[PDB]
Amino acid sequence: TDRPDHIDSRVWELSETQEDWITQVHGHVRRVVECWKYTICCLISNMHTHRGAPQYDVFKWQDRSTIEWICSKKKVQYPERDTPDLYDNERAVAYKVLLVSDLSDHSPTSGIYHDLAFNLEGEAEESCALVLRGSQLQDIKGFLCRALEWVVSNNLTQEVVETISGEAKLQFSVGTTFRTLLKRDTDWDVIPTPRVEPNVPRIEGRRWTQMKKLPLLKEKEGPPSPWRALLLGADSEYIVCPPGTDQEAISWIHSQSEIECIRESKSTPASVITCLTSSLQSFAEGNPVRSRIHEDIIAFGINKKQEKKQSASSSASGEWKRAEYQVEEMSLPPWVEEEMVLLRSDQEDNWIELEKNAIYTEVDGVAEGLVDKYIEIVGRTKVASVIEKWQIAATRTFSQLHTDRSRITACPIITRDPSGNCQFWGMVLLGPHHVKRDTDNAPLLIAEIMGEDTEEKYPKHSVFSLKVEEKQFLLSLKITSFSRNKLYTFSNIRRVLIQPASIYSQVVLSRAAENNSLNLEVNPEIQLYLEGAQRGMTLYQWVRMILCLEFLMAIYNNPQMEGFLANMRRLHMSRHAMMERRQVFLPFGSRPEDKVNECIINNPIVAYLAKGWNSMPNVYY
Amino acid sequence: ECTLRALVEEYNGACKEAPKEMSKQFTDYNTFKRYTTSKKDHAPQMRLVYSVRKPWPISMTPSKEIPLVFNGTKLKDTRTRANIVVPDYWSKYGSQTSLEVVNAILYAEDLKVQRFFSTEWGEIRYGRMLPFRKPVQACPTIEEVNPASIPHTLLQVFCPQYTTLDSKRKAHMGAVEKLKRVMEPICKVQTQESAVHIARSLIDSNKKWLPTVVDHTPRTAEMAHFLCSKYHYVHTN
Amino acid sequence: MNLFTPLSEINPTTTQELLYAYTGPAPVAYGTRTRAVLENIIRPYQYFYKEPNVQRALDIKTGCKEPEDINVEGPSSGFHTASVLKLADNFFRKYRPAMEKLKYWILVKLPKLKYAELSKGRQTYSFIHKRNLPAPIALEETVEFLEQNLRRKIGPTLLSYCQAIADVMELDETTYETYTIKFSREELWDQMRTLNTMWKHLERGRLNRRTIATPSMLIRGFVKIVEDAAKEILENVPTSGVPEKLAKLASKQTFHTAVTGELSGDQEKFNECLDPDAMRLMWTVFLRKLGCPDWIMELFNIPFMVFKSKLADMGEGLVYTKGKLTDRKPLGEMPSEFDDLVRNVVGNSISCRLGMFMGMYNLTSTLLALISIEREELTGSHVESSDDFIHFFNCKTHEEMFKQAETLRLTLKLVGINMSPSKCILISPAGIGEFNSKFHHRDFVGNVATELPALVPNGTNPMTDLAMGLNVIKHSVNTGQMNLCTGALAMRIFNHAYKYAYMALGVTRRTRFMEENAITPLLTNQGASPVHSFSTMHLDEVALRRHLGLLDEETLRRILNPNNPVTEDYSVPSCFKYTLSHKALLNKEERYQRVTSIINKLFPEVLIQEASAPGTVRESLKRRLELVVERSDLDEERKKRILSRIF
RNA sequence: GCAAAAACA
């Protein structure tokens, strides 16, 4: 409660923190008793001196660092859990103020310090009389009396006696009103004591069946999925340019290019070619950022939301209903196999230029040899060049959208072959991109050099005819939006190399373990199910196709892809179990293929993986 | 003394400008030690490219040893903010320190380099070998120190005056004198938090889950990332 | 998919790490969470009876049901009380050392827990500013509110904080206090009950997005107490998924003719079929057989009873479309598929006694599952982490194994766990399985990461970024997720990204400045050749360069000088370890920063241990400053002059 | 247009 009358303020706010009174059984009474002890300590010291310095040091409720300093002087040392309350310079001894019930049953607590005892009605132990002065004893009398009157008046005699006898006891209390609030939404008390005999009932269950044959995934029906990635992929080409800087290459392209529309798409109108030509002209002049032209409204969707809202408001009819969304079901397109076969085609250069790490030990040499050989086998491939293009384009787009501009930024996609020549894959144009959150979409107008045009594969792309010098090239424009998170993720697209490298390294190290000798020239034969038959292919091209699949999965990642993979892990495990002549058993209502089929809706590579699974044997002997 | 006067003036400033904060319990320091208004960034690596390329990326304490403009390049904003090339300038035209300070700062890190280069490597053996992970002491220490006594050992080295008898008692003696001798040039008001960090790592016996083909000594545990794997084992003499 | 399934020299288990989307972007949860939250809330009310009856399940307080009510052909919400009692008793009897450690933690370590550890928690909804706030700010405002309403100072221990919460819950009126925020017992109760929901971001492997709930700061102390006790138990039981355990079971050779099987599966709707009262009963049984006092029981039972009264926020509203228009409307305004729950709407929150939410009691749910495991028929090795489990059966007969698996399913159903039939697969000969992203094949357990290492600098500063990148790659190597070639390739990719992020590649302003001023590149972040090899991932950059002669003593003294204007992460301090970069909160933050700055200078020991030292900051600083002046071996006159100015 | 059970423009 509040401060007792006899205890003065200073001791009260000194004792407020010394101990956790609220968690003690009699914390208020315990605090009052400790305040009594501190007041007795202060009365014993008072205004007394020995050799010009105070005779007593009141260690109780004093800073521990100060106590240790004072003990460093005088050459004493006291543990913190048995620290005496007082130290007397006259006798060079330390005292502890103690309260007891009777003075007859008193013994020295310990040899470190002497005991000052009081029985709570004023009188003291004979040792206290032999030590303390008459005035000090009278003051202790006059405090313990008129503290006892407060004890009796509030009827705390038993609580005080309990506090004196034992030490502090921990507790935690919940009162009536909080208890009633707690009991509102349950059928039991605060401590649940249901009146039921413990028992485990016998419940009839269903029967466990066997998955004799592997599940057959569902192939969806509908229009084939168009290409819906940020960039072109396997159909990506570059224009060889004379050696120089990016500005020189862009000027060379812009000065000797004629552009005519071949195929026009309603999604990307042919009028947005003006934006790309203006960006090329500005970049050739040294300005990667240009002002806004009229076609930039359509190209980057400026003020599109505030027009669609008015269109919807004008076209308002009927009553409100819960918005049921739907995802169009699409079938496996023919272009996925073409993309896979084209991504593995060989290239002249290496396209993977990573600085080598240091080499100090033989383990480092082995690791760097493995990495070098993996780069050799997956470098001179089209998929590596496409990964490089994706990396450069995403990095340059990401690095230019933090500014929050109102103008159009141009980010050319240019590589260098090991001869100095500039390779122009295309350019990405960034709109105003007033981006608030990391998931916000930045408007883009991507131009890429196209190997071949397919309206079925690219319905939303506008394909233009591009002629430089005497060569013919195809240029594709697509209006697109793409978030900060996804652009940052694809700027680190080189991490797709890890998993094929993991597989290659595991195969090589397995061979090394078998023969107890590292050989980086191993190109073993890997048996696989191909066109529904068991033939084999070499390690190198198998790793190439794995890298192609991983790149396609990475650029086509979405909730369907991740759900499909997470639910095909179980079926892949089951298939591997059935290869080892193991039996697979399922609970009641177990349809593992349903978890996968829920995820096959319109993803081209999910469908490609599903068809690859379906062409495999479903029963093993 | 200047140090005492500086401490007093800052203390009076805290009492005046932040009275309510000074009226809090001293144990509350464990709470407002990390009292930050800024929300946690789930993707801090995603801002590095922009942050490095901003004008004046680096925040610096005001000083005169760095020119405002160095060969047509403005180094500081004239707290004050520094150009990204300021650490590059300091690596060539900066103020030097004593060799003893360098040795103490590189201590517990120079030791790891010496241990790597003072050991000889056997031939790599490739085979079907199963790395099973157990918790072992990751890094060798100057003295073997029981955990939960590491903080008490640190108190004796750094602030032996601000400690109790029991904390003094439950402290590894022998490791205090080694730590005191090697940390002496950097046990000052500045780099006190750094010197504690090197002091911890010198006697920290934390256990980590590491691949094992044979039982790792503390020497081989810090190198378990290349000593063993699923397909190879390296013998250390 | 056939390309991912080899038939020679390598098995599909190793290549099953290819069925991942490491490089692709993680899915983003857009827009309202109201539909997902309402679905999560309504699932327990549809699974309480075999034939769905939401209206009859909405007036159930304690999710207790008869054994005949349990649905074996579908999901079942609720628990059987006698089953819970017997299972908890069996769990207590078998794992006796774990409960002895629980008793020691309760008696010794529980009273010493400090409520400042609540500041280390994640984001918390503030009942004063009515907004989401960082954990330190919420803790500070809650403690100040408690002190204002209780006329006393809250002790540093967690028990003192919980006692303060219990005491303030008993006041008719509470205030905050210049704006005066006025509460009531019912309003403060509602804030205590309320769960703040949000999308679970950056989650992989799911077609549908999930939501998670956060407790109020008024209940997080009790939640931390119960979760710490649950962790103390789970760290000492062999059926918990915490150490290893999967590898131990994989390497355990059973017999030569025994019928040994391996069951791998997930739990369907794990948090949507759990009732807090079952955990209350389990905890009460544990404490009662431990001999704990009644106040321990009350302390452990408060959290789950508050959860039984939860007021989970139902997002921003349900999406409605007239034509092409889109509107966001609360539940109950117009008909929807959640019209049964309209009667439970309290403001923008909805009350729901049954079911739980993900991210609230992860360890107590695991404990409930593990006590469900404890039977006489289930003589098999079980390991489980929340909703993911693996079970090993060592039987002598296939029918015996099948009966044990069915008994496992039913005994999980007794408390409402309901493993997913389509996600649980049992292999008749043991030796192939999966559990918690570890893939087991014969005498090999392969840890496959759910997320590939970022291979990008963390964004603090070049030395720390290099240190943590190398440490992440080294940890990936240690877990087995990476090997020699993979580790070195990751190092090279990280090195390229690290150099690019710090203007060390091509021609930039930094490289131009270094070239014009003849500043040779001596560090990796400066464009120098990388000094780290695969075997030297654990070595610092400043070292290993002095040793190899790439850094001379002059530049070492120049960059390691502590007086530089710019200044586990085992990176030595250097000039390259720099730093790049709510009305009444910023000023309070800067005042607290100044108060922190005066400490760590007068108190060297707070850098080693906690603050302790009972008392307030003012007089503690006062007396420490007095002591340091008095023990400064200076003249008496100077000491007196200095102390005369200390006020 | 990007996206996928609803946001960005």
Side-chain angles (χ1 to χ4, degrees), chain A residues 198-212:
Chain A
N199 201 66
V200 285
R202 277 313 163 280
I203 288 181
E204 293 83 3
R206 303 295 163 266
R207 179 71 275 171
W208 279 60
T209 62
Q210 185 179 4
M211 190 176 68
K212 309 215 190 93

PDB file of all heavy atoms in Angstrom, chain A residues 198-212:
ATOM      1  N   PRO A 198      -9.490 -40.450 -16.606  1.00  0.00           N
ATOM      2  CA  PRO A 198      -8.584 -40.549 -17.757  1.00  0.00           C
ATOM      3  C   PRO A 198      -8.698 -41.900 -18.447  1.00  0.00           C
ATOM      4  O   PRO A 198      -8.760 -42.947 -17.800  1.00  0.00           O
ATOM      5  CB  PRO A 198      -7.203 -40.357 -17.125  1.00  0.00           C
ATOM      6  CG  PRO A 198      -7.468 -39.472 -15.959  1.00  0.00           C
ATOM      7  CD  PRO A 198      -8.804 -39.918 -15.415  1.00  0.00           C
ATOM      8  N   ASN A 199      -8.709 -41.865 -19.778  1.00  0.00           N
ATOM      9  CA  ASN A 199      -8.861 -43.064 -20.592  1.00  0.00           C
ATOM     10  C   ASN A 199      -8.604 -42.710 -22.049  1.00  0.00           C
ATOM     11  O   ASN A 199      -8.882 -41.589 -22.484  1.00  0.00           O
ATOM     12  CB  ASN A 199     -10.260 -43.675 -20.440  1.00  0.00           C
ATOM     13  CG  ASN A 199     -10.304 -45.133 -20.840  1.00  0.00           C
ATOM     14  OD1 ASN A 199      -9.696 -45.985 -20.193  1.00  0.00           O
ATOM     15  ND2 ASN A 199     -11.024 -45.429 -21.915  1.00  0.00           N
ATOM     16  N   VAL A 200      -8.081 -43.679 -22.793  1.00  0.00           N
ATOM     17  CA  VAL A 200      -7.906 -43.569 -24.236  1.00  0.00           C
ATOM     18  C   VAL A 200      -8.953 -44.463 -24.902  1.00  0.00           C
ATOM     19  O   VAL A 200      -8.834 -45.697 -24.864  1.00  0.00           O
ATOM     20  CB  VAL A 200      -6.479 -43.932 -24.670  1.00  0.00           C
ATOM     21  CG1 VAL A 200      -5.525 -42.809 -24.307  1.00  0.00           C
ATOM     22  CG2 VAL A 200      -6.013 -45.216 -23.997  1.00  0.00           C
ATOM     23  N   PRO A 201      -9.996 -43.895 -25.499  1.00  0.00           N
ATOM     24  CA  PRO A 201     -11.041 -44.723 -26.108  1.00  0.00           C
ATOM     25  C   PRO A 201     -10.531 -45.478 -27.322  1.00  0.00           C
ATOM     26  O   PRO A 201      -9.586 -45.063 -27.995  1.00  0.00           O
ATOM     27  CB  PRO A 201     -12.111 -43.699 -26.508  1.00  0.00           C
ATOM     28  CG  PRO A 201     -11.364 -42.407 -26.608  1.00  0.00           C
ATOM     29  CD  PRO A 201     -10.366 -42.474 -25.502  1.00  0.00           C
ATOM     30  N   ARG A 202     -11.176 -46.608 -27.595  1.00  0.00           N
ATOM     31  CA  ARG A 202     -10.915 -47.376 -28.804  1.00  0.00           C
ATOM     32  C   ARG A 202     -11.858 -46.892 -29.897  1.00  0.00           C
ATOM     33  O   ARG A 202     -13.080 -47.017 -29.770  1.00  0.00           O
ATOM     34  CB  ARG A 202     -11.098 -48.871 -28.549  1.00  0.00           C
ATOM     35  CG  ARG A 202      -9.884 -49.548 -27.934  1.00  0.00           C
ATOM     36  CD  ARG A 202      -8.606 -49.159 -28.661  1.00  0.00           C
ATOM     37  NE  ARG A 202      -7.415 -49.470 -27.879  1.00  0.00           N
ATOM     38  CZ  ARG A 202      -6.957 -48.726 -26.881  1.00  0.00           C
ATOM     39  NH1 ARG A 202      -7.567 -47.609 -26.515  1.00  0.00           N
ATOM     40  NH2 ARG A 202      -5.862 -49.110 -26.235  1.00  0.00           N
ATOM     41  N   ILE A 203     -11.291 -46.338 -30.964  1.00  0.00           N
ATOM     42  CA  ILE A 203     -12.054 -45.759 -32.061  1.00  0.00           C
ATOM     43  C   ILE A 203     -11.801 -46.591 -33.309  1.00  0.00           C
ATOM     44  O   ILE A 203     -10.649 -46.896 -33.636  1.00  0.00           O
ATOM     45  CB  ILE A 203     -11.676 -44.286 -32.293  1.00  0.00           C
ATOM     46  CG1 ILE A 203     -12.218 -43.412 -31.162  1.00  0.00           C
ATOM     47  CG2 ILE A 203     -12.203 -43.798 -33.633  1.00  0.00           C
ATOM     48  CD1 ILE A 203     -11.914 -41.943 -31.331  1.00  0.00           C
ATOM     49  N   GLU A 204     -12.876 -46.974 -33.992  1.00  0.00           N
ATOM     50  CA  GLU A 204     -12.737 -47.703 -35.243  1.00  0.00           C
ATOM     51  C   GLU A 204     -12.215 -46.778 -36.335  1.00  0.00           C
ATOM     52  O   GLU A 204     -12.737 -45.681 -36.547  1.00  0.00           O
ATOM     53  CB  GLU A 204     -14.075 -48.310 -35.659  1.00  0.00           C
ATOM     54  CG  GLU A 204     -14.574 -49.411 -34.735  1.00  0.00           C
ATOM     55  CD  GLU A 204     -15.286 -48.872 -33.508  1.00  0.00           C
ATOM     56  OE1 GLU A 204     -15.449 -47.638 -33.405  1.00  0.00           O
ATOM     57  OE2 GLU A 204     -15.680 -49.684 -32.645  1.00  0.00           O
ATOM     58  N   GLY A 205     -11.172 -47.233 -37.037  1.00  0.00           N
ATOM     59  CA  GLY A 205     -10.564 -46.471 -38.101  1.00  0.00           C
ATOM     60  C   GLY A 205     -10.753 -47.149 -39.450  1.00  0.00           C
ATOM     61  O   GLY A 205     -11.295 -48.256 -39.552  1.00  0.00           O
ATOM     62  N   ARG A 206     -10.301 -46.460 -40.492  1.00  0.00           N
ATOM     63  CA  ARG A 206     -10.386 -46.983 -41.844  1.00  0.00           C
ATOM     64  C   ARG A 206      -9.151 -47.821 -42.167  1.00  0.00           C
ATOM     65  O   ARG A 206      -8.245 -47.989 -41.347  1.00  0.00           O
ATOM     66  CB  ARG A 206     -10.567 -45.846 -42.842  1.00  0.00           C
ATOM     67  CG  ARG A 206     -11.782 -44.985 -42.566  1.00  0.00           C
ATOM     68  CD  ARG A 206     -13.055 -45.793 -42.740  1.00  0.00           C
ATOM     69  NE  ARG A 206     -14.203 -45.153 -42.111  1.00  0.00           N
ATOM     70  CZ  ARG A 206     -14.620 -45.411 -40.880  1.00  0.00           C
ATOM     71  NH1 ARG A 206     -14.004 -46.296 -40.114  1.00  0.00           N
ATOM     72  NH2 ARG A 206     -15.680 -44.765 -40.405  1.00  0.00           N
ATOM     73  N   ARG A 207      -9.114 -48.356 -43.383  1.00  0.00           N
ATOM     74  CA  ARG A 207      -8.088 -49.306 -43.780  1.00  0.00           C
ATOM     75  C   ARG A 207      -7.039 -48.605 -44.635  1.00  0.00           C
ATOM     76  O   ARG A 207      -7.366 -47.737 -45.449  1.00  0.00           O
ATOM     77  CB  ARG A 207      -8.695 -50.475 -44.561  1.00  0.00           C
ATOM     78  CG  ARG A 207      -7.671 -51.497 -45.033  1.00  0.00           C
ATOM     79  CD  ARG A 207      -7.142 -52.277 -43.834  1.00  0.00           C
ATOM     80  NE  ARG A 207      -6.040 -51.599 -43.163  1.00  0.00           N
ATOM     81  CZ  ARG A 207      -5.515 -51.985 -42.010  1.00  0.00           C
ATOM     82  NH1 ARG A 207      -5.923 -53.084 -41.397  1.00  0.00           N
ATOM     83  NH2 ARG A 207      -4.573 -51.237 -41.445  1.00  0.00           N
ATOM     84  N   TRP A 208      -5.778 -48.982 -44.444  1.00  0.00           N
ATOM     85  CA  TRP A 208      -4.677 -48.454 -45.240  1.00  0.00           C
ATOM     86  C   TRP A 208      -4.506 -49.290 -46.502  1.00  0.00           C
ATOM     87  O   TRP A 208      -4.345 -50.512 -46.428  1.00  0.00           O
ATOM     88  CB  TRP A 208      -3.381 -48.452 -44.430  1.00  0.00           C
ATOM     89  CG  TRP A 208      -3.259 -47.293 -43.493  1.00  0.00           C
ATOM     90  CD1 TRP A 208      -4.103 -46.975 -42.472  1.00  0.00           C
ATOM     91  CD2 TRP A 208      -2.229 -46.298 -43.486  1.00  0.00           C
ATOM     92  NE1 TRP A 208      -3.666 -45.843 -41.832  1.00  0.00           N
ATOM     93  CE2 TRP A 208      -2.515 -45.407 -42.435  1.00  0.00           C
ATOM     94  CE3 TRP A 208      -1.092 -46.074 -44.268  1.00  0.00           C
ATOM     95  CZ2 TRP A 208      -1.708 -44.311 -42.145  1.00  0.00           C
ATOM     96  CZ3 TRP A 208      -0.294 -44.984 -43.980  1.00  0.00           C
ATOM     97  CH2 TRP A 208      -0.604 -44.119 -42.926  1.00  0.00           C
ATOM     98  N   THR A 209      -4.538 -48.630 -47.654  1.00  0.00           N
ATOM     99  CA  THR A 209      -4.386 -49.293 -48.940  1.00  0.00           C
ATOM    100  C   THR A 209      -2.980 -49.079 -49.491  1.00  0.00           C
ATOM    101  O   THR A 209      -2.170 -48.333 -48.936  1.00  0.00           O
ATOM    102  CB  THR A 209      -5.428 -48.783 -49.941  1.00  0.00           C
ATOM    103  OG1 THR A 209      -5.236 -47.381 -50.161  1.00  0.00           O
ATOM    104  CG2 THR A 209      -6.834 -49.025 -49.415  1.00  0.00           C
ATOM    105  N   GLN A 210      -2.697 -49.748 -50.603  1.00  0.00           N
ATOM    106  CA  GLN A 210      -1.402 -49.666 -51.262  1.00  0.00           C
ATOM    107  C   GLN A 210      -1.523 -48.902 -52.573  1.00  0.00           C
ATOM    108  O   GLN A 210      -2.464 -49.114 -53.344  1.00  0.00           O
ATOM    109  CB  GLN A 210      -0.834 -51.059 -51.533  1.00  0.00           C
ATOM    110  CG  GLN A 210       0.571 -51.046 -52.110  1.00  0.00           C
ATOM    111  CD  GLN A 210       1.116 -52.438 -52.346  1.00  0.00           C
ATOM    112  OE1 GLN A 210       0.420 -53.432 -52.147  1.00  0.00           O
ATOM    113  NE2 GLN A 210       2.368 -52.515 -52.778  1.00  0.00           N
ATOM    114  N   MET A 211      -0.564 -48.014 -52.822  1.00  0.00           N
ATOM    115  CA  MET A 211      -0.459 -47.332 -54.109  1.00  0.00           C
ATOM    116  C   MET A 211       0.308 -48.257 -55.044  1.00  0.00           C
ATOM    117  O   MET A 211       1.530 -48.173 -55.176  1.00  0.00           O
ATOM    118  CB  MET A 211       0.228 -45.981 -53.955  1.00  0.00           C
ATOM    119  CG  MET A 211       0.169 -45.111 -55.196  1.00  0.00           C
ATOM    120  SD  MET A 211       0.894 -43.480 -54.942  1.00  0.00           S
ATOM    121  CE  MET A 211       2.619 -43.911 -54.746  1.00  0.00           C
ATOM    122  N   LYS A 212      -0.424 -49.169 -55.689  1.00  0.00           N
ATOM    123  CA  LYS A 212       0.216 -50.172 -56.535  1.00  0.00           C
ATOM    124  C   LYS A 212       0.880 -49.537 -57.749  1.00  0.00           C
ATOM    125  O   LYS A 212       1.986 -49.932 -58.136  1.00  0.00           O
ATOM    126  CB  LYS A 212      -0.808 -51.221 -56.966  1.00  0.00           C
ATOM    127  CG  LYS A 212      -1.612 -51.801 -55.815  1.00  0.00           C
ATOM    128  CD  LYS A 212      -1.935 -53.265 -56.046  1.00  0.00           C
ATOM    129  CE  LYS A 212      -2.930 -53.776 -55.018  1.00  0.00           C
ATOM    130  NZ  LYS A 212      -4.334 -53.667 -55.500  1.00  0.00           N
TER     131      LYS A 212
END
